[PDB]
Amino acid sequence: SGFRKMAFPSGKVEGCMVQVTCGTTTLNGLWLDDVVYCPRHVICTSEDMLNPNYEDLLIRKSNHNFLVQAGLRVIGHSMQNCVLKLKVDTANPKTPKYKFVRIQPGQTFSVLACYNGSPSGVYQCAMRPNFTIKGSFLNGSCGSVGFNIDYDCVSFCYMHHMELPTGVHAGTDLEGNFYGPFVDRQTAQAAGTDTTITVNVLAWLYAAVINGDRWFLNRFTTTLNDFNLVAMKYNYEPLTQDHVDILGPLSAQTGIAVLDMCASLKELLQNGMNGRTILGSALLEDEFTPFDVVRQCS
Amino acid sequence: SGFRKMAFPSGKVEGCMVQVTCGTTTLNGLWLDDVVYCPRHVICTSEDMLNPNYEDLLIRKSNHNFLVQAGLRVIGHSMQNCVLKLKVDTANPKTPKYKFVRIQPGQTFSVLACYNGSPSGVYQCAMRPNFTIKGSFLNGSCGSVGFNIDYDCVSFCYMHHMELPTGVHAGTDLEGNFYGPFVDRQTAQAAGTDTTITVNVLAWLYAAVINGDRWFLNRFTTTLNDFNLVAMKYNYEPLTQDHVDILGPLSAQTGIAVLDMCASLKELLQNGMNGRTILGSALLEDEFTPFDVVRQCS
């Protein structure tokens, strides 16, 4: 027993991390086969960032303007949305089986935080409903990636680009499309309103029951519609029958019906914990998906 | 910015994990050079565990009684305290630069949770003052290891053996010596009284200030002796001048004197948070060492 925020083993991704330098800027790149992927803002100076014409700035750059270090001669350079793709003369012999996926809000992934092409740590993040993540990133961490491992395949889903002034993080998929409304320009930007990921809080209450914390259970049940009236008041996402179906494996492992767990969540929202804790927390946790609970508890 | 519980990159350790089976029992082993290390209780049946004479049980075993799978012929077997060392016919070609260290209570490490010799996840643990850890381990996770990475060397410090009925975990160093009073016998055992790791809570308050949470700061200071009268009342470890010295780098990064931070901790202990949070927590966190904060924030 025990329930912890757990990252995927990072070995397969560690062998893909390289350092990319353009001008005075140094950040990380992801080396897969003979291509190094990194944030396109690596080509910008601070003055360029105020109003960058990335097409014109990329035209001015040549292959020799990119210094790529793995522990690599750049033979081509191109841009795909907000990512730069540097074709190199050597295929990464450590390239794992991989896919690029654009993940949905509410889903989790592991981040391999890197500096100067060297991995420093690994931790889990959820993609918030407002398309930000709450991670740990300093200057130089750009190009660090988020991923999931499914069977024997690394699914890359995130590349780091920036921190918003609210202290949350933003970036793109590996095709260079930002998650959320964000742009790679030095202009005022703000994330939209966030909400709590209801299906994840229910998954974490199931994790709590599996791991011996049951005090919040009650004899009551609710309808999906009545629960959603409370979710709205507390800025929790509406729960759908699809969310109920996704929680099915947890309902079977514990024998507790999803709508019965919804009545527990209703009481916690309205009354709080009265000084008690759930899995070592005094607040409700929403960064574990139902699959995260199933995989960890199985 | 941002502050997260971060594990070390696990690649170097992933290549060392193997599966060890003896009789009906399957657990994990650590393969370094031509030796596989695992918990000696792998040789016991459930009846043997009630009162095992490990010396006699090991004498009855032969090399062919151990099935070692990496993804290995056992040519020798011996016991060192509570670890079994299976000499194998093949040196691990993925053996990293490593050391075996016995860590001190209050220190942290990364755990690579494994099942059937396959890594499943990685997360940080602190060795509690009562020599237990609060992890996530199921049946089959025995032999999973804890480690730190220092420069380019893996320092192994923990091997998993058991869960106590309070839901906390216990194990040994890589020389087979248990942390704490625990024994590998099926007899009633209980951890001693735990306490909160004061120097770690102060490190996490410094992490909070570095990351923008400053509401708990006040104009007051305390003496080390006056602070320790409050620490005693709240079951916090006494703070020493050595702890004050260890916090020096954090005091320099923030410009906040250690005894000034001790006055903040005193107010939090006596009055609580009044519904506020620190780094996304409604409780005081003690599983980050001062070095964990320095390495993550630098």
Question: Could you give a quick summary of the protein structure above?
Answer:
By secondary structure, chain A is an alpha+beta fold.
Explain this structure to me?
The structure holds 2 chains of a larger assembly. Chain A is α+β, with helices and mostly antiparallel strands and 298 residues long. The first copy, chain A, has a domain at 198-297: main proteinase (3clpro) structure, domain 3 (Orthogonal Bundle). In chain A, 24% of the residues lie in helices and 26% in strands. Chain A is built from nine helices and twelve strands. Chain A has a six-stranded antiparallel β-sheet with strand order 4-1-2-3-6-5, with no helix packed on it. In chain A, strands 7, 8, 9, 10, 11 and 12 form a six-stranded mixed β-sheet that branches. In chain A, β8 (108-115) and β9 (118-126) form a beta hairpin. The interface between A and B is large, with 40 and 40 residues. Chains A, B: The active site is at residues 41, 142. Chains A, B: This is 3C-like proteinase nsp5. Chains A, B: There is a cross-link at residues 5, 87 (Glycyl lysine isopeptide (Lys-Gly) (interchain with G-Cter in ubiquitin)).
